[PDB]
Write a protein that binds this ligand. Structure first.
Ligand SMILES: Nc1ncnc2c1ncn2[C@@H]1O[C@H](CSCC[C@H](N)C(=O)O)[C@@H](O)[C@H]1O
Ligand SMILES: Nc1ncnc2c1ncn2[C@@H]1O[C@H](CSCC[C@H](N)C(=O)O)[C@@H](O)[C@H]1O
Ligand SMILES: Nc1ncnc2c1ncn2[C@@H]1O[C@H](CSCC[C@H](N)C(=O)O)[C@@H](O)[C@H]1O
Ligand SMILES: Nc1ncnc2c1ncn2[C@@H]1O[C@H](CSCC[C@H](N)C(=O)O)[C@@H](O)[C@H]1O
Ligand SMILES: [Mg+2]
Ligand SMILES: [Mg+2]
Ligand SMILES: [Mg+2]
Ligand SMILES: [Mg+2]
Lengths: 383, 382, 383, 382
């Protein structure tokens, strides 16, 4: 929890004042911040290009202190980093700590120039003209690390295919919809909760969507909730929590410890009652201006999921809930006793987006007022 | 019809090849195109700033030919243009015809530099530092005209307030939602249909929203359908049509004459049956990738509009329709005991956006396939 | 200085974590934050529409505390606000304090829905159908206040015409260039310095550009430096400083007290030596990744400005400086003794943008390395 | 020439009216257009994912006619397409011709939903939950093809690395600067000229940058000029031309045949005189609002490239030229003792962008007027 807190403080400083970032850099120090930034460069530079073992140095300096890391990249292998000297590495990237913190965790347009220093094959051990492979592999190696040092907008469809989540590809085509409804939050220091880590009780299974969310939300903290243990996936900005979406107390404990959440995604049991329980408990805890997403609406018709093989969808099914939420947004126009008090969902659901197998709920203040009484409601009133 | 066609050709060439624009400029000529561009400038420069009567010259040149216009701006007065010599007018703007066509009807980011020439008070009415009012009115006048010569993104909320449509302000707050769902089409040569011009049978009334759509869609042709005549609102890129949204034949005639439409907006009678008839007839005619919008969902509960004062909403009411459209998007996941072929709305509705008093329908191909049979449907399958 | 500090803390919290904003709201309290937000609504809602005197209520609530303000709008008059009851004002806007802080000072896309509550003529004292003026003036009045409650992107050309600065209109056409080079910083908590407040020694003169920068940078602190007093213009997010751009010590004192600056604009004396002194002293103090802007390059040829009526421009003139800066960006490719050490401007100028009467300097690390020795430099080397 | 013209007509119609697209689809027909679209899909879907041989079907329909293609993807292998029946292929993508034309060559935001149909493993090779590799390879294959069917914004840095051009990586870092200055033209039907195809006189060499420009400008026609033959690189939207940048007649011939150009990039000999000759001849031919780019400013100091090893840079060297262009932008503010008429570069250069080893020149109208005579020029004037 102190670890998540330290990464968060760096993320927030990246988007704050110069004085705030200076205070944090002075407080934590280069030795402590550097490894967090190298961890990000490794996660973002993946995957390594199809090249022979090639070393690339990253040097971070701050107020007279400098730390050097040598990253090793090779076709089909996890990129590795080591705090080591760089004098014999002809591929080098240099950064002021303030610049690298912004490059990785800063909001706003990626910088096109001036964020770093570069040394590319200024000396070659081969001879005078560097070998073809040496030159080719060099270009690819330094380019891969540079790509991992920044926050250039990624393509969520490509990320989904790379991390192997079923949010994109033949089973579902949700990623462009996520870009539409969540893209305005990409530069924001978000806390995202996804219910359903993936992999069920299979050992070593799941986390694909969580890694995608970590990559897309460069300033985000990703939380994954599952009834089964997923602690093996825990990493920088990615925390798994063991909890049951059927139990309101367990849901509230997740929010009490890791919330509040800007975005909540239901991709869990798909059991009709669990979807409803999760929305009733977490929608009031969701940040106002946030988005609640329900994936796999098809379970509405599957008895094995507490659904009913009937259309219109049976009450207590996800499609019936979505239809009621739709009418709820119009609560102020509905016939009601003056004493009527709107439900939480009626007052706090400002937008409903329904697509195939997915719904997006926008939380906000639904209180613009019903059509005034002085508006004609009949030709009788017109006349 | 030839007039609407000429403006359309200019708009389409503005986003085409150099050869296509060259061919159109050669065929129509400067004398014909320039008045279309001046009309746009007058429409987009409005309103005139709070200044005393001030003249600004606009000169358009093309392949050895040049035409001069002098615009007159004054507080509270309609901006006027006359084809006259620039002469002594000390506020001047010059353009190559190609640059002005792109500036007014071109897609893409507004140019920040190099699109025109300018002369500002090289000669004053004193012979030296101009009078305080001459300088202030001069800056305001030339700035107003230049603003009218481009396609810089407008604020739809401010346009709705300026043109006085109820789409924004206290009765409704729809304009930001329109920006969200129609913003991607602002650079497109769209044909927009709004059912409901406004003003009912009152003389000289309506057209506020149509003027807003003309200002927002700088490459768009705006069509307003109304059961009553609204020909007095007719102007460049803005055509009114007399037709009844309750009658499928009249809706089809509107589409056959002025379609197809990228965007259709129902802001008409608000009578439940008319909303259903308009959607059933025009949704199939809407361009795929287009957006159908229904305003005033409240009439769902008003008996005077064919509504029923009950909740859940009665069958045959707009909210009930929206709930059925929502379920139809999931048609591939629904149980179908025998041969089923999806309805048009099930197959062509890809997205439903429901807010307070407004719904946005995205038309497309809804055929990604239902969940495959090999997917577990129960722990017994597990 | 405690005032600037308090507005800054609110601005930074608007773009931080939920916990950070909660901590600040709890610390300062609604009573202290509310007036800062009302001050912004008045500055941004200006000008009032051409309407008869109309009242619009803004109500801000936070954790069981609520404060009500009544804004009065009238054709040709400064919008006024008073902490007052709202029961008899039929035009009302309601906000949670967290939502209003983000709406005014938050980074990111303006919210399209759910940020506030609205009451529009639910009761009219006139009768049942409100009068035409009453209805028309109402629409305009509430719309104007709503526009002042947010950060919807403004048009810098229109702002320049409204505030009456010569950056746009016949004398200059710089505002679209400012949008191009400074637009990526609009959502950033910037500190901007403009040298030249305007109005010279004329009493009550100047500040037009400063008000424009305050309006455009909704999260920004605007600083205006002038040899003459301009304290009468001082307001929320807008501080004037008496200092001389000819004196390096006075320039450094401005940066020591109000810096560091993300953006510095020279629109002052236009005296060739003052432009050079200002750039030599403040470019090293400018934030890396920031922009230095020099307006009115025409003084390069005006003897009355220490210029020379000659072309090519004489050494010590702004155009000559810009040409040397241009060559300086290529310092690594220039013939030099190996011992050569790049100047500050050579090492820290990554981009030079020259337009008519204006130049934009991008500060960053100019250290990608010169063309390697192993690159053929002659057909002799080729053969 | 007719082939380049047919692809150009398709691209222009993709951003035109419904009527214009309808007319082109009727005139050319599905049989003619579909192979152009399949060629784009193969170019944009590359590279194939690291999978075992997998087939993906693409079906395009138009007014009662439908054609089927089966694409084959395999690790390290060139993606192949064949016009064959979809048959049993379990990975399928369907498109209406109009939707596919817009998806590949349309301007504007990529569509997030409704642009196509899809079938994914409705039948597996086991009869039940597909084999682990069948499912993984299936997701990768269909995703790769769908990616190739659209105009989603690419990362120019990644494209430069994928196509292996030195515009990015250790020798140069220009691609983000290209995104800044050319990004606004990505949705435009551009004609781009790069002087310098690459590969010199080595057999089979060059074209890396030309392939990058084709991928980035999804509506663009790419032209590569080189003194040596590069016809082997010729492909859809990518034409090589043999011409000498030292010879004004050859540069004019390139423009007369394949112009006018929205963007011209000098990455050729790097010989100082050739850079000056190319700019003097082609800048007047460049579209106003267009961008002229000069790479490799370092040759300014290299005697083997006509440079002089001195600083300040010698007259007749590229850096000296850039310094003179910078001063020319201020031509209206310069003292002119007698009648002066500005040069072409003074009148048509509106912006100069100088970075390390690269310059971006914006062409436009540089005529805002010098400072008016009534402006004080001295405290004596004050
Ligand atoms: N009651 C419950 N509470 C929480 N998680 C549950 C649950 N029942 C099942 N789950 C988990 O929900 C997950 C659904 S699979 C999630 C896949 C992942 N989101 C991706 O897109 O890659 C499984 O891992 C399962 O263990
Ligand atoms: N059956 C029908 N067919 C078409 N238009 C109809 C109609 N019944 C009523 N209308 C028209 O629908 C309009 C509704 S008011 C439209 C307001 C306008 N869109 C604005 O925002 O400014 C009226 O002008 C009315 O005459
Ligand atoms: N040496 C100096 N140091 C600082 N400011 C100076 C100065 N000499 C003159 N100035 C101030 O520079 C200003 C130039 S006018 C600035 C106009 C303003 N930026 C706008 O665009 O609206 C004058 O107010 C003048 O008093
Ligand atoms: N006079 C001349 N006219 C045209 N091309 C020339 C030339 N002299 C040399 N060239 C060509 O200029 C090219 C320079 S290398 C181009 C690299 C390519 N743009 C890339 O980024 O991948 C060589 O292919 C060379 O043959
Ligand atoms: Mg799932
Ligand atoms: Mg309405
Ligand atoms: Mg000035
Ligand atoms: Mg090069």
């Amino acid at each position: 929890t102190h670890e998540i807190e330290t990464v968060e403080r760096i993320i927030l400083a990246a988007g704050s004042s110069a004085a705030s970032l200076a205070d944090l850099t002075t407080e934590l120090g280069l030795a402590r911040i550097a490894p967090v930034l190298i961890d990000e460069i490794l996660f973002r530079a993946e995957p390594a290009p199809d090249i022979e073992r090639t070393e690339v140095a990253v040097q971070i300096t701050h107020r007279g202190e400098t730390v050097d890391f040598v990253l090793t990249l090779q076709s089909g292998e996890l990129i590795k980093a080591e705090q080591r000297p760089v004098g014999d590495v002809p591929l080098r990237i240099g950064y002021e700590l303030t610049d690298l913190i912004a490059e990785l965790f800063g909001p706003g347009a990626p910088r096109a120039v001036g964020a770093r220093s570069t040394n590319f094959l200024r000396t070659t051990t081969s001879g005078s003209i560097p070998g073809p492979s040496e030159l080719s592999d060099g270009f690819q190696a330094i380019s891969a690390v540079v790509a991992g040092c920044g926050h250039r907008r990624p393509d969520l469809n490509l990320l989904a295919s790379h991390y192997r989540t079923d949010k994109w590809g033949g089973l579902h085509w949700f990623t462009p919809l996520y870009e539409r409804h969540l893209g305005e939050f990409r530069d924001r220091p978000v806390r995202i909760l996804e219910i359903g880590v993936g992999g069920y009780n299979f050992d070593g299974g799941g986390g694909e969507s969580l890694k995608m969310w970590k990559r897309y939300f460069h300033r985000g903290l990703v939380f994954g909730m599952d009834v089964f243990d997923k602690s093996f996936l825990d990493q920088q900005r990615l925390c798994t929590v063991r909890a049951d979406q059927s139990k309101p107390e367990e849901l509230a404990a997740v929010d009490d410890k890791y919330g509040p959440f800007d975005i909540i995604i239901d991709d869990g049991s798909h059991i009709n009652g669990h979807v409803r329980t999760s929305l009733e408990t977490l929608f009031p805890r969701l940040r106002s201006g946030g988005v609640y997403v329900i994936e796999d609406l098809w379970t509405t018709y599957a008895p094995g999921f507490g659904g009913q093989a009937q259309c219109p969808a049976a009450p207590g099914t996800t499609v019936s809930l979505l239809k009621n939420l739709l009418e709820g947004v119009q609560h102020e126009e509905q016939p009601h006793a003056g004493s009527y008090e709107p439900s939480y969902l009626e007052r706090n659901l400002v937008g409903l987006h329904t697509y195939h197998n997915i719904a997006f709920l926008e939380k906000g203040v639904n209180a613009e007022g019903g059509v005034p009484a002085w508006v004609p409601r009949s030709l009788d009133d017109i006349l």
